[PDB]
Amino acid sequence: KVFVDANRFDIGDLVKASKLPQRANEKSAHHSFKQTSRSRDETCESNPFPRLNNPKKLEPPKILSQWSNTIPKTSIFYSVD
Amino acid sequence: MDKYTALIHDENFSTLTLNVSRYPKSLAYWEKLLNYIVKASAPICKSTEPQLLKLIRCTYSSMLNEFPYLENYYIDFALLEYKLGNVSMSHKIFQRGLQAFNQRSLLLWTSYLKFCNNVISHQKQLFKKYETAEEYVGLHFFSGEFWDLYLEQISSRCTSSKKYWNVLRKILEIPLHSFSKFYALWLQRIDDIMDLKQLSQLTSKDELLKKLKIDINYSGRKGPYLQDAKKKLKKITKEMYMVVQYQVLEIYSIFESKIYINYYTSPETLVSSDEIETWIKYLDYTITLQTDSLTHLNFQRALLPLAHYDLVWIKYSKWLINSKNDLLGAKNVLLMGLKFSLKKTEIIKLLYSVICKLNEYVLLRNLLEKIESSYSDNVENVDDFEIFWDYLQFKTFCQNSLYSSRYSDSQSNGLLNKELFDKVWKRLSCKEKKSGQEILLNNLVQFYSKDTVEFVEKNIFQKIIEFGWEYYLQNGMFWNCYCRLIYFDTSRSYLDKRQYIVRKIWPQIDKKFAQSVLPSLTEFCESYFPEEMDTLEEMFTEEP
Amino acid sequence: MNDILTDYKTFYLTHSNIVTYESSIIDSNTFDPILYPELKMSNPKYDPVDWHKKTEWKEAGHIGITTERPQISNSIIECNSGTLIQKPISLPNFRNLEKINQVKINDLYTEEFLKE
Amino acid sequence: QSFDIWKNLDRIRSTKKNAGQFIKGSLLILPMRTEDKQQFDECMDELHKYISKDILRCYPQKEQKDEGMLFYIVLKDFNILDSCFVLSVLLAFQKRLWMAPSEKSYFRVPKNINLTGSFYLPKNIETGSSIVEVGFNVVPDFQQFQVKACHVSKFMNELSNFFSQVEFGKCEANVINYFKREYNRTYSQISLALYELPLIGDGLFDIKSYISKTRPIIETSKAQMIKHISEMKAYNEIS
Amino acid sequence: MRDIVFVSPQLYLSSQEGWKSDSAKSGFIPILKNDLQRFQDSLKHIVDARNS
Amino acid sequence: NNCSIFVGDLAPNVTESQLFELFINRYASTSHAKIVHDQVTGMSKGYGFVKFTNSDEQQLALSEMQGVFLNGRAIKVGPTSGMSQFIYPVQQQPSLNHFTDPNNTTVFIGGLSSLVTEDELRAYFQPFGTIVYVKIPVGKCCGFVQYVDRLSAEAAIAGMQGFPIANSRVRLSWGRSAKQTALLQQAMLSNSLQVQQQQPGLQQPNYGYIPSSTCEANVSSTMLPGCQILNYSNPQQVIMQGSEAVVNSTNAMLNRLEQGSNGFMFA
């Protein structure tokens, strides 16, 4: 209802208005991946347990590559894989 | 007919509304009903019926009053009211949303400030609102979007080019998750310097003259002078970068790489045993830093996923008690813990002691009135004994507070009050349905007087002997408590009470019922009556 | 100790009044017999009433292993920007920047049990 | 010093360096609770005979609980002495009902009692000890302030040192009714939360779907726990 | 509003006054007026377990 | 190393088995291979990933498959992984001792006076969490307290530190189990490797369990999240958390006070 950026209330009509309707057939036949358009009607009954449906591990805090040589090379805990 | 009349007479709307109002704490029913109401208005505009818009506003208000921890739906209804024309109602919805988390929710501050970047029409009020968000929520770990937005607003609105340096210098000491973008902005803004006189935008001139041994007004060849300035400031920034990098790397690699859920799902959800444990570990780390805004922020962040598990409520209440000596804060924590937690035993038991330390006992009586009226004066037939016993201790304390003593030796009447003994006897008459039977029998024998022990032995124990109920005659712990009542008298001698217990109790109990009494009476006889062991053995022997 | 404190919370709330209770409250050790038996359940030691050099700042994020983490002395993370704009902020004072890789472990298991 | 209110009032009038001027735009709200009304009425009539109507106002409840009343005491445009006097009298009276039912003096404070209370102030304060602020207040607009375990003279000195440093100003006109509505709303919410306490099991949680939603999951978690116990037993076995 | 009634089970299953209303009070669920008997007939077993 | 190669522009009649046969067993050993198909249609999009163990074999396969005939078209098996400022942090390992293991939940206790028993030492460490064994070495004035939770070990070390047991101050640290100590003694007598093993996990996620929760004692459980669902028994099995737990614990502590006032147990 907020983060999908297409079911947004104030600026969702601007997203739904100019689709760039791809009057070229090659622009529609180029991409062959899924759209994954999340509708507004998705409720809490779908995906009840967020850990069984496989999540992603969060990204680490990125550091500057010019100052990457001063990282602590020894970690606190043993991390596997 | 319009869409509102067709919405009333529709068959699905009544069924969805009754399934919502049948189980109000099922959030999926609320979301299906809300999506059906929004689907009923496929054009959403200001030209629709206000008789349906009032129903939409009442539905959102009921959903946000039933579930105030939903972060996205305050944003949804606030931008809905912004779509419907007005912004004062949207500001009221944002204010009650930020009050629902008590000013410590990052997403609502971020969405409210992205809203306020267009609607405020005033610069000083925007700066006061962003500084309020800075002093309350500005120490959040994942607040990169908030500080990126605030630096963007400073770089777009301010023309003096001084407040940006101040805020970015503050950010270079805060342990943020996305922190290296701010260091990269700092390093490319040091590169974007034009002369030496802008070094007063960083610090004062005496701190440059003392710590870095550099002058602003040093005139001459300022090329290598400014290059040495850049090198020394880059070295100081590199040292502070190592400090903040070690802090953020420690917090991530120990704590933040384990928590996968940071949002409020539902009161019906389940959170894994890893995440609860890592929230407790992260808050134990957070208490040690002794930064108060960050500590209250991280406790609110831990109240975000799992406020129904009641552990972080009691932990944050105990932290406000012992570490700060701010106990009204813990009282408000335990008051708001009643509104969300499902296991309301330990929070109310701690809140009793919190109220009793404050010496506000009319508030304690008004609180206990809500428990004794929540059952409609039927607290003796409750399944959970932990509620009734924690009620009964402090209700006995209040009855000792109001009424004076009846017995001698300055002994005030405890559980044997006219408003208390009937509630105990109403529970003891069930004998198989209500647990905590022997707890009262061990706690009604804690008076130790001459007339009060006689009073207790006359009201219940002689009455159990007179009726002859099967459950108390079968259990030997009942007779153990009855013998402990007489044997610890403070007025009788040893020989008279010993003759009493041996002669006029042990022949009274049944011989065929002694199979469950003898494992409980043998311990008492080995405890206090050593020479009376073989006498009791010859009474309960295998042959007549 | 938990059994004694729970039995005292059972007995004291049923055999005392506010007149005895309010005279027993002292401010030298914040002693209150209703709430003090609850806080003393978790830890056996409990005091009633220089932080960076103690034994709690060092093993905060991880127990057993001690370390001296680097910090900033004149930290401005608590002061709002409405007060930091009043005067230019001084240089950051540094400490413990020579132990960013050095960590020590009080290894008792090898020294007292393996190597005797 | 002594245990009398008026001697400490004379002392706090003497050596507080021209403390006769009141505070511009000053407001204080003390919500209190009494078991009975008839004992409260004589002390409040004596207080209105001592303190004027324009400075202090009183607000009753709606009698919804019928056992525990809730009375607002609003001190508006008050001086520093009348605030100390009113707070000393009310903090003595709302604890004398539990400690000393036989003393029978509404303006003489005994030695066995310690003053401990909680009073609200508006948010627009500027302070630039026994009275402390609170963290995580329950009121959206107002700030709760705590005093704990003091004698009479310490209460006088601490309240005067608190009001000599704080700076009030620009209060809203009908903020009293706003605080009344918000206070009633918050405590009606927690009373409804206590009303939700017997309705946990089978009442309003949709148990018929919640059993079937978690029936394989708890079984698989129990199988994981049994596998964890067996793997721990294999890990601790010497063999 | 016509053809509406505001009701919450938190004040009805606890058997308190003011459990139903016709005006927009904060914290109540709006249901239809003709289905209030269907709401009262649905929570019969909880009231029967509360009385017994 | 796990070098990854991205094959692209494949034909429609090429499944994962044909890609695994063309990638593995040809002068290399591909560890994994997966063709990225559609989300709802099931057809392949023409792209696939192949992750091998060695980087040299994957580089040789990418150099040999550059332009090979793959189901009538090209293979395009060039590598996918392997001047920006932002790079992910990389770390080494602490070589897995018994201090730097986050799953290490057993506490080594020392400094005893060789006088405390096993049931009494159980009674010291009982309310901090559920426990499995309290056995101690004889004549060594030390012991081992293994919990199930790591937060329970944190609470035990944070509370029990500096607590004198029988007029003798305690020393709390970490340590391995008895079998791992015997393996370390057997590997240290010859001094060949002296390598340790990590303690096994919990096979997370675990929705029912609540950490730092103890229970000593039909069951009609509603499995509500505010209460407790499952728990570890006190020796050991898995028990469903009933409602009459605080009642049984209260009866047990009253029985413990009654049997400790006389001297039937010292714990």
PDB file of N, CA, C and O in Angstrom, chain B residues 487-508:
ATOM      1  N   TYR B 487       1.519 -27.289  65.385  1.00  0.00           N
ATOM      2  CA  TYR B 487       2.828 -27.565  65.977  1.00  0.00           C
ATOM      3  C   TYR B 487       3.683 -26.310  66.140  1.00  0.00           C
ATOM      4  O   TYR B 487       4.508 -26.242  67.059  1.00  0.00           O
ATOM      5  N   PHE B 488       3.489 -25.300  65.290  1.00  0.00           N
ATOM      6  CA  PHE B 488       4.229 -24.047  65.400  1.00  0.00           C
ATOM      7  C   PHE B 488       3.474 -22.979  66.181  1.00  0.00           C
ATOM      8  O   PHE B 488       3.626 -21.783  65.893  1.00  0.00           O
ATOM      9  N   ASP B 489       2.660 -23.376  67.155  1.00  0.00           N
ATOM     10  CA  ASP B 489       2.019 -22.413  68.040  1.00  0.00           C
ATOM     11  C   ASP B 489       3.060 -21.795  68.968  1.00  0.00           C
ATOM     12  O   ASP B 489       4.051 -22.434  69.332  1.00  0.00           O
ATOM     13  N   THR B 490       2.829 -20.541  69.349  1.00  0.00           N
ATOM     14  CA  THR B 490       3.747 -19.799  70.201  1.00  0.00           C
ATOM     15  C   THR B 490       3.272 -19.695  71.643  1.00  0.00           C
ATOM     16  O   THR B 490       3.977 -19.110  72.471  1.00  0.00           O
ATOM     17  N   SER B 491       2.103 -20.244  71.967  1.00  0.00           N
ATOM     18  CA  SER B 491       1.566 -20.179  73.319  1.00  0.00           C
ATOM     19  C   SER B 491       1.567 -21.515  74.043  1.00  0.00           C
ATOM     20  O   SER B 491       1.736 -21.537  75.265  1.00  0.00           O
ATOM     21  N   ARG B 492       1.390 -22.623  73.329  1.00  0.00           N
ATOM     22  CA  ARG B 492       1.341 -23.931  73.959  1.00  0.00           C
ATOM     23  C   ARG B 492       2.749 -24.443  74.256  1.00  0.00           C
ATOM     24  O   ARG B 492       3.747 -23.957  73.720  1.00  0.00           O
ATOM     25  N   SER B 493       2.815 -25.462  75.109  1.00  0.00           N
ATOM     26  CA  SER B 493       4.065 -26.152  75.403  1.00  0.00           C
ATOM     27  C   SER B 493       4.324 -27.194  74.315  1.00  0.00           C
ATOM     28  O   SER B 493       3.683 -27.202  73.263  1.00  0.00           O
ATOM     29  N   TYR B 494       5.278 -28.094  74.548  1.00  0.00           N
ATOM     30  CA  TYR B 494       5.541 -29.153  73.580  1.00  0.00           C
ATOM     31  C   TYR B 494       4.706 -30.401  73.839  1.00  0.00           C
ATOM     32  O   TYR B 494       4.205 -31.019  72.888  1.00  0.00           O
ATOM     33  N   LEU B 495       4.537 -30.768  75.112  1.00  0.00           N
ATOM     34  CA  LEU B 495       3.884 -32.028  75.456  1.00  0.00           C
ATOM     35  C   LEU B 495       2.393 -31.992  75.144  1.00  0.00           C
ATOM     36  O   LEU B 495       1.836 -32.982  74.658  1.00  0.00           O
ATOM     37  N   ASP B 496       1.741 -30.851  75.386  1.00  0.00           N
ATOM     38  CA  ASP B 496       0.301 -30.763  75.162  1.00  0.00           C
ATOM     39  C   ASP B 496      -0.046 -30.785  73.676  1.00  0.00           C
ATOM     40  O   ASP B 496      -0.960 -31.509  73.265  1.00  0.00           O
ATOM     41  N   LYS B 497       0.697 -30.043  72.845  1.00  0.00           N
ATOM     42  CA  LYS B 497       0.423 -30.091  71.413  1.00  0.00           C
ATOM     43  C   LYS B 497       0.878 -31.408  70.797  1.00  0.00           C
ATOM     44  O   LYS B 497       0.271 -31.869  69.824  1.00  0.00           O
ATOM     45  N   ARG B 498       1.907 -32.049  71.367  1.00  0.00           N
ATOM     46  CA  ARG B 498       2.314 -33.359  70.871  1.00  0.00           C
ATOM     47  C   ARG B 498       1.255 -34.412  71.170  1.00  0.00           C
ATOM     48  O   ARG B 498       0.917 -35.223  70.298  1.00  0.00           O
ATOM     49  N   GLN B 499       0.699 -34.390  72.388  1.00  0.00           N
ATOM     50  CA  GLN B 499      -0.393 -35.291  72.736  1.00  0.00           C
ATOM     51  C   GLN B 499      -1.637 -34.997  71.907  1.00  0.00           C
ATOM     52  O   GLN B 499      -2.349 -35.922  71.503  1.00  0.00           O
ATOM     53  N   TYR B 500      -1.877 -33.714  71.606  1.00  0.00           N
ATOM     54  CA  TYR B 500      -2.993 -33.315  70.751  1.00  0.00           C
ATOM     55  C   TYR B 500      -2.866 -33.911  69.351  1.00  0.00           C
ATOM     56  O   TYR B 500      -3.793 -34.571  68.862  1.00  0.00           O
ATOM     57  N   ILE B 501      -1.700 -33.726  68.719  1.00  0.00           N
ATOM     58  CA  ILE B 501      -1.486 -34.187  67.348  1.00  0.00           C
ATOM     59  C   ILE B 501      -1.479 -35.713  67.276  1.00  0.00           C
ATOM     60  O   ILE B 501      -2.046 -36.303  66.346  1.00  0.00           O
ATOM     61  N   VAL B 502      -0.890 -36.380  68.271  1.00  0.00           N
ATOM     62  CA  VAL B 502      -0.822 -37.836  68.221  1.00  0.00           C
ATOM     63  C   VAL B 502      -2.183 -38.462  68.528  1.00  0.00           C
ATOM     64  O   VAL B 502      -2.644 -39.353  67.802  1.00  0.00           O
ATOM     65  N   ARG B 503      -2.869 -37.991  69.572  1.00  0.00           N
ATOM     66  CA  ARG B 503      -4.079 -38.660  70.031  1.00  0.00           C
ATOM     67  C   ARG B 503      -5.331 -38.265  69.253  1.00  0.00           C
ATOM     68  O   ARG B 503      -6.187 -39.122  69.007  1.00  0.00           O
ATOM     69  N   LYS B 504      -5.482 -36.996  68.861  1.00  0.00           N
ATOM     70  CA  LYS B 504      -6.759 -36.535  68.323  1.00  0.00           C
ATOM     71  C   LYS B 504      -6.674 -36.072  66.871  1.00  0.00           C
ATOM     72  O   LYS B 504      -7.527 -35.298  66.425  1.00  0.00           O
ATOM     73  N   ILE B 505      -5.659 -36.509  66.124  1.00  0.00           N
ATOM     74  CA  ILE B 505      -5.604 -36.257  64.686  1.00  0.00           C
ATOM     75  C   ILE B 505      -5.369 -37.560  63.930  1.00  0.00           C
ATOM     76  O   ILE B 505      -6.116 -37.891  63.002  1.00  0.00           O
ATOM     77  N   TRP B 506      -4.341 -38.306  64.323  1.00  0.00           N
ATOM     78  CA  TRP B 506      -3.936 -39.516  63.608  1.00  0.00           C
ATOM     79  C   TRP B 506      -4.930 -40.684  63.683  1.00  0.00           C
ATOM     80  O   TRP B 506      -5.046 -41.412  62.689  1.00  0.00           O
ATOM     81  N   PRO B 507      -5.662 -40.933  64.786  1.00  0.00           N
ATOM     82  CA  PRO B 507      -6.776 -41.895  64.679  1.00  0.00           C
ATOM     83  C   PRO B 507      -7.971 -41.380  63.890  1.00  0.00           C
ATOM     84  O   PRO B 507      -8.811 -42.193  63.486  1.00  0.00           O
ATOM     85  N   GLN B 508      -8.083 -40.069  63.656  1.00  0.00           N
ATOM     86  CA  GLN B 508      -9.245 -39.549  62.943  1.00  0.00           C
ATOM     87  C   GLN B 508      -9.168 -39.791  61.441  1.00  0.00           C
ATOM     88  O   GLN B 508     -10.209 -39.940  60.792  1.00  0.00           O
TER      89      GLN B 508
END
